[PDB]
Write a protein that binds this DNA or RNA. Structure first.
Ligand SMILES: [Mg+2]
Ligand SMILES: [Mg+2]
Ligand SMILES: [Mg+2]
Ligand SMILES: [Mg+2]
Lengths: 98, 167
RNA sequence: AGGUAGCUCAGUCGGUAUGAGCGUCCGCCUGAAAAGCGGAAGGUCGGCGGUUCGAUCCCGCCCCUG
C-alpha cells in the first residue's frame, strides 16, 4: 500500500479531481474524498505508525511526497477559486458614485 | 461648510472598495476620497462589515468668499419629467449635466428621482427619470416654450452621453 | 508557570484536535423581539528557525501576562 504505484495512482486521481473542480462546494467534496480521513493518502500515513522501524524512512518520504503533491494542488486551487469568488463580489457590488 | 462645489468621480484606491469609491475634486484638483472600505481590509483589520470612510485634505480646498445675487422670478413655473435611457455605466451626474447644458436659462431645477433597469429597457442599459422645473424671468412661460427647452435638453443628452428618449 | 475555535478555557508525551461554555449562523417560539429550548459552522495548537521520512508534542532563539 505504501508502494510507489498505489501512491502515484492516488496522487493522479486527486490532482485531476482538483483540476476539474470549478466551485468551492465541488472543491470541498473533492477535499474530503482525496485528503480526508477516509482518503488513500491519509490512510497511508496512519499505517506508518504500525510499520517496522527499518521501513519508515524509506516509505515515509514516499508517502509524504504523495501527500505534499495533492496538498499543493488543493491549496493552489482553493486560492484560485476564492480569488475568483472575491473578484466577482467586487464587480457585482459596483455603484454609481455620482 | 466650505462653500465650494465638488465633483465625485469613480476611482480605485485602497483601503476603499474599488466599486464603491469616489475621488473628490474641487475644480480639477483632487482633495481626497470617500466611500465604502474594501471587504478584504475590513476582514484583515477586524472592522465592522460595511464600514465607510472619508478623508479630505483641507489645505487643498481653496478658501472662498462668494457674494451671491440670486435671480428670483415670481412668474409661474412649468413642471415636466423626462425619462432617458443610457448605458449602465454612464454616471447619472453626466446625464444631468448634459440635460442642464441644453435646457438653458429657463431650467430652474433638475432632480433625478428614478433609476431603473429591467427587461423592457434591454441589457447593459439603465433608465433615469428627472423632474424638471422651468421658469421664465419676465413672463408666464408657456408649455410650448418649456417643451422646446425640454427638447433641446434631450438633444444635448443624446449628443453628450448617448441618451435615448424613453419609449 | 501558561499562550489550544471570534472570546474565555479542558485536553493531546512524534503519525486520528477528543473538546466544552459564550458568541455567530440556522430552525422552533413571537405580529416582530428579548429570554428559552433544538441544531450547525468554527481550530498553520504564540512567531522565526533546528532536529525528523513526519512537529501543536522534542531542541534553540524571541514576542506576550503573574
Ligand atoms: Mg407640465
Ligand atoms: Mg426611468
Ligand atoms: Mg408568531
Ligand atoms: Mg455537525
Amino acid at each position: 500500500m505504501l508502494s510507489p504505484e498505489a501512491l502515484t495512482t492516488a496522487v493522479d486521481a486527486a490532482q485531476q479531481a482538483i483540476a476539474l473542480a470549478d466551485t468551492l462546494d465541488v472543491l470541498a467534496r473533492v477535499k474530503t474524498e482525496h485528503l480526508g480521513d477516509r482518503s488513500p493518502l491519509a490512510l497511508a500515513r496512519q499505517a506508518l505508525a504500525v510499520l517496522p522501524k527499518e521501513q519508515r524512512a524509506e516509505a515515509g518520504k514516499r508517502v509524504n511526497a504523495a501527500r505534499n503533491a495533492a496538498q499543493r494542488s488543493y491549496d493552489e486551487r482553493l486560492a484560485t477559486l476564492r480569488a475568483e469568488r472575491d473578484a466577482a463580489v467586487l464587480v457585482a457590488e459596483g455603484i454609481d458614485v455620482t | 461648510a466650505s462653500r465650494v462645489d465638488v465633483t465625485l468621480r469613480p476611482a480605485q484606491y485602497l483601503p476603499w472598495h474599488p466599486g464603491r469609491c469616489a475621488q473628490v475634486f474641487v475644480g480639477e484638483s483632487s482633495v481626497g476620497h470617500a466611500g465604502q472600505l474594501h471587504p478584504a481590509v475590513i476582514e484583515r483589520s477586524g472592522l465592522p462589515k460595511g464600514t465607510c470612510a472619508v478623508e479630505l485634505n483641507l489645505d487643498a480646498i481653496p478658501c472662498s468668499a462668494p457674494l451671491p445675487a440670486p435671480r428670483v422670478s415670481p412668474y409661474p413655473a412649468v413642471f415636466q419629467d423626462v425619462s432617458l435611457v443610457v448605458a449602465a455605466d454612464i454616471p447619472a451626474q453626466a446625464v444631468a449635466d448634459a440635460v442642464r447644458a441644453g435646457a438653458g436659462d429657463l431650467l430652474e431645477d433638475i432632480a433625478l428621482f428614478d433609476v431603473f433597469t429591467g427587461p423592457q429597457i434591454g441589457e447593459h442599459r439603465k433608465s433615469l427619470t428627472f423632474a424638471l422645473r422651468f421658469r421664465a424671468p419676465d413672463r408666464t412661460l408657456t408649455e410650448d416654450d418649456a417643451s422646446a427647452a425640454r427638447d433641446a435638453a434631450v438633444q444635448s443628452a443624446a449628443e453628450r452621453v448617448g441618451a435615448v428618449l424613453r419609449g
